[PDB]
Amino acid sequence: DAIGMVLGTEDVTPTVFWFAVSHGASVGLDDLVVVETRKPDGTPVRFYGLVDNVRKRHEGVTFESDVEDVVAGLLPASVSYAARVLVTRVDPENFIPPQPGDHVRHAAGRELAMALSADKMEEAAFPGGLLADGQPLPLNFRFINGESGGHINISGISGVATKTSYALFLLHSIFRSGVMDRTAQGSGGRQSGTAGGRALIFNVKGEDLLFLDKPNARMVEKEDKVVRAKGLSADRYALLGLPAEPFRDVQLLAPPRAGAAGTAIVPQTDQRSEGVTPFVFTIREFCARRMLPYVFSDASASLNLGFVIGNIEEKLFRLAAAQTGKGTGLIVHDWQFEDSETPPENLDFSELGGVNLQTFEQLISYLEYKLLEEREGEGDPKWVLKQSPGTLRAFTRRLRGVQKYLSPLIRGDLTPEQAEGYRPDPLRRGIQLTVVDIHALSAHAQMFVVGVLLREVFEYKERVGRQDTVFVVLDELNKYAPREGDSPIKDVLLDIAERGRSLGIILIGAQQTASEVERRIVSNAAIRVVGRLDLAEAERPEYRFLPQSFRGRAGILQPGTMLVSQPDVPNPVLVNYPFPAWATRRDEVDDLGG
Amino acid sequence: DAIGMVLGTEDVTPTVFWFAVSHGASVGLDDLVVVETRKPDGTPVRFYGLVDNVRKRHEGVTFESDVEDVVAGLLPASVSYAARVLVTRVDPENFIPPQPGDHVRHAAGRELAMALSADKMEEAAFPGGLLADGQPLPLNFRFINGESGGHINISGISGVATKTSYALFLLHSIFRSGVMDRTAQGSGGRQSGTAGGRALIFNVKGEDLLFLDKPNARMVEKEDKVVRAKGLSADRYALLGLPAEPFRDVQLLAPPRAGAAGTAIVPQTDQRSEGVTPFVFTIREFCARRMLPYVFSDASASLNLGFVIGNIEEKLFRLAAAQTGKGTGLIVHDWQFEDSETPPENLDFSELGGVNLQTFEQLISYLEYKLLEEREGEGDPKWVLKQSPGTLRAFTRRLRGVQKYLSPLIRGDLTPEQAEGYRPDPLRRGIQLTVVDIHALSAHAQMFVVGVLLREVFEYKERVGRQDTVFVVLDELNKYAPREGDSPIKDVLLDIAERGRSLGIILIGAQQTASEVERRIVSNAAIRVVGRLDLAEAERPEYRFLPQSFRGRAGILQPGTMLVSQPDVPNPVLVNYPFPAWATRRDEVDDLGG
Ligand SMILES: Nc1ncnc2c1ncn2[C@@H]1O[C@H](COP(=O)(O)OP(=O)(O)O)[C@@H](O)[C@H]1O
Ligand SMILES: Nc1ncnc2c1ncn2[C@@H]1O[C@H](COP(=O)(O)OP(=O)(O)O)[C@@H](O)[C@H]1O
Ligand SMILES: [Mg+2]
């Protein structure tokens, strides 16, 4: 039943020590063990620890070429199988040394709970993945939902480290474990419900986050091989107390077909058209809800246009509040264009002689007249508050650059019912997971939609309060929150990281290297997960929470294998987690066989 | 009675040396020891120290595979139990080595006092926590009240390290140990009183810092377990000479129900309604006491609005000094609004044709008029003061963005008596502890309240003087005093750190990592305390006061275990402190269970 004995040839310190592996037992690199030592007065002191180094030496072989004789039986040789243990816990916390010869044994039952501080987690423990020998690793939800700890940060080489798919596994674990229930017993209103929970996620890389609403045909065939190979009792999900089933209550939203002058509205998706709902903003919303700054996120040097943008934002806001009509466009009455080079065919003209702006192009043209033509090119003084003409043209030119890409999204030609039906609500009643398909959008349109949608949820939580947890799963954090660049979308993320704990917005974010992301986003994550990391980044300052033992291991980490670090447990523990039950590509949705 | 003997196999130097543990004795890692050696001429020299390394070896084992046989007795081997002693003090200051074979014994009586420099502390020593075996740790109050020492800085993993709970323990020890008396009698005029010691603390994270008035139902069940396990003589509080009771005279202040257009005033309290008093500021107080800059504390790039803020601050200051009325609002006579988009409703129009500003939004609207509409936009040059319109709308817009969150706190509609009663006074007569509930406020409203309150106490001490000690207990020191940002709330924290010693304001600050806080705040902390530190941060330059021997140990410190480092004693000492006698959550007050 024991696994080894504490070695005496090496120093035995309370923090770290070596032990010799017993015959007939194997010790893997990441095994969790427990050793119990006796004090002089006879009181026990238990040491819970994790293996970080493992080796084998040949005892007494002398010259190396003796092996041929040695293994033939001619020369006597003993094999020395040794393991180093990094102590994570001392239950009576006497920092005394164990005695050499104390029995080392695998932490398997309550001993494992003590080894992973599961007593500190209490009911808030939920499946975080599988350990070496099929024992689920317990994550403390109180360090994920804001109660005691913030959000999560996942890192690793894209394509190899499985961060996005792991984040979806964490979502499945959180929704399917009842951990939101158990930890909603904490109080009646501080945080409450497992039904209340919601998740918002964006489909940046094209068509990969759709088919969460269809089961993965391939899961059992790939997962059978793992259960066959590692000799597990069952499929991993059942080991977790998790079901091997896809996401439920899923809302799929996509931009409207990039329709050029077409009133017909259909989503852009080629590979999936069923169950996909188009989402659009309206010109009047755009001005009423102050969406203008979220067009501006350059992730480069640029200038300080904050004055210009702030002024026109307020001008549009008061304009939209002045609108009395039910339409989705913005009616402006002060647009006269003798020779502002726009054509007169298509402008819908109001009953009161006003011009009704129906497309994003018109909204930008009207911004051009007020800023650069209102009075023979010097512009409307009330719109350009003495701002430089160059500064104006930059602003205008960046709006022009993205309007070809953003125009289908922001529509003033729609009628009021179409606008209320197509309006993007990541918090719609009865929906648990909302996927926003921004894959066909441009690098600018993408962060526009991400910007206002995150802001809309956050504004909603400020206004309403914090008894519903909303999960935002965001890949490529560096572009959204760059280390030195300053931007409005970054600002909303700064708001979710720093204030979202007590507001109820949890970020499960991922990036290839945390060193390219804003320090304040990475710093505010209680849970840090590491996939296969780059050999150069492992020694960076952002990954010191990995002991040196772990970087070399972290360079060859296999897909499906992650190192999670959570505040309760002072060491990274390695975990594997099942394949997605949810389809992650089109052919995994095969209703009828292959 | 002895514990070991100085070893002769390792070097014996006066600063560091090893000794062999006697059989039947246990030597923990942080134990305090004394060894006495004899000079050639017969004079004794005492060495007091602290263990920093401890190990066990197998002496006389050739191969590690022999280990199993060794335990049976088949082969011969002896266990070597050795400890390294980091010398902290020599009674006679002679830097001569102790001879191998000198006797090592636990510092237990007067010897313990000599190891912890308690003779330097004199009457100013007070309990700072419990040592390895039940003896209280002396803390030098003179290094906390400003006489020879200053303030306190606590570092550690939030949620695991118990820094907030420890800080309240320090208040409890300071108030209930009569140390304020003992060290007040050196000269009564110089520094006077245990009744004159007060505390101000802020309740940000949850409803966690209310119910400090109420006893903790759960602490006997939790503290019984520790006394049972560690074989201590009594409950830890009795060991310290401290009582297990809550704070004596407490005042709980809360924001006013976020009342929308409601004259009724009630605290925002949802779980604790009894004993909570609402606090409010008045528009007139806002202008008279110069509360304007403290709205602006973004702690980022921001802008140079200091000129704008300084101008409008002085303008509102002279405006308030000109006010003759008894009302709480500000009456301005130069506000005309022919098309300012303002409303025709009750402005409590004055008898003299002036407008009486009663809400924060009105004050911002009047500011918008003077700065952006006065002379059809260019404004009153006694207000805009040649400042650009972009900067002007920026100052305006940031006031607008924050107005919704700060409006319920700043009321000019209140009557003079409601104002004098609801005014927040951390120094109220007959109060020892003041708790400010800002958990319901936004990130901006919180920074505001903390700013003007800390400034109010600081101004009062400048004006009055220093025979009352006021303790400010502040968690999350990284957001309030960032390392690189610059804000007014950081400036009052800087004034407290650099001047608070001789003014009587002592800061008990806590943050996850000292490396994220302003250097000047952390540098002026005479007492540094460390709970479980991040593996990454222990090697940072801000934690060099931890010797390398401690780092690995500090990575795994258990909740309730802290390393205090004080100027008198040259090394960090590990301590344990009781569970809170005061309730720290709702169900702790009245659980009636077990
Ligand atoms: N548990 C797993 N084991 C192995 N491969 C997995 C596992 N889960 C997902 N994958 C696959 O490995 C890749 C996962 O990477 P993904 O998370 O999509 O990208 P990244 O993590 O770089 O954002 C995809 O090929 C995915 O289908
Ligand atoms: N004396 C104590 N010993 C052990 N745990 C304690 C003690 N006092 C409080 N705790 C618990 O430890 C945690 C302390 O976290 P807290 O102090 O609130 O946050 P932080 O330490 O980051 O400021 C909470 O679970 C608290 O109930
Ligand atoms: Mg991805």
Author numbering:
A (entry chain H), B (entry chain G): 13 to 606
Give the text the authors published on this PDB structure.
The drHerA-ADP complex was crystallized in space group P212121, and the structure was solved at 3.4 Å resolution by the molecular replacement method using drHerA apo structure as the search model. The refined drHerA-ADP complex model contains two hexamers (twelve protomers) in the asymmetric unit; each protomer is bound to one ADP molecule. Although ADP•AlF3 was used as an ATP analog for crystallization, the density of aluminum fluoride, which represents the γ-phosphate position in the transition state, is missing in the density map. The residue Lys217 and the trans-acting residue Arg513, as well as Arg154 in the neighboring subunit, which is supposed to bind the γ-phosphate group of ATP molecule, are located quite far away from the ligand in this structure. Therefore, this ligand-binding structure was considered as a drHerA-ADP complex. The binding of ADP resulted in each RecA-like domain to move closer to the neighboring RecA-like domain, generating a more tightened hexamer but still a more-or-less flat ring. The overall structure of drHerA-ADP has a height of 100 Å and its outside diameter is approximately 105 Å. Interestingly, the hexamer displays a certain asymmetry, with ~26–28.5 Å inside diameter of the putative DNA translocation motifs, ~23–25.5 Å inside diameter of the putative DNA entrance, and ~27.5–29 Å inside diameter of the putative DNA exit. Such asymmetry is probably due to the differences of ADP-binding states or simply because of crystal packing. In this motif, the conserved lysine (K175) forms ion pairs with the β-phosphate and the threonine residue (T176) coordinates a Mg2+ ion.
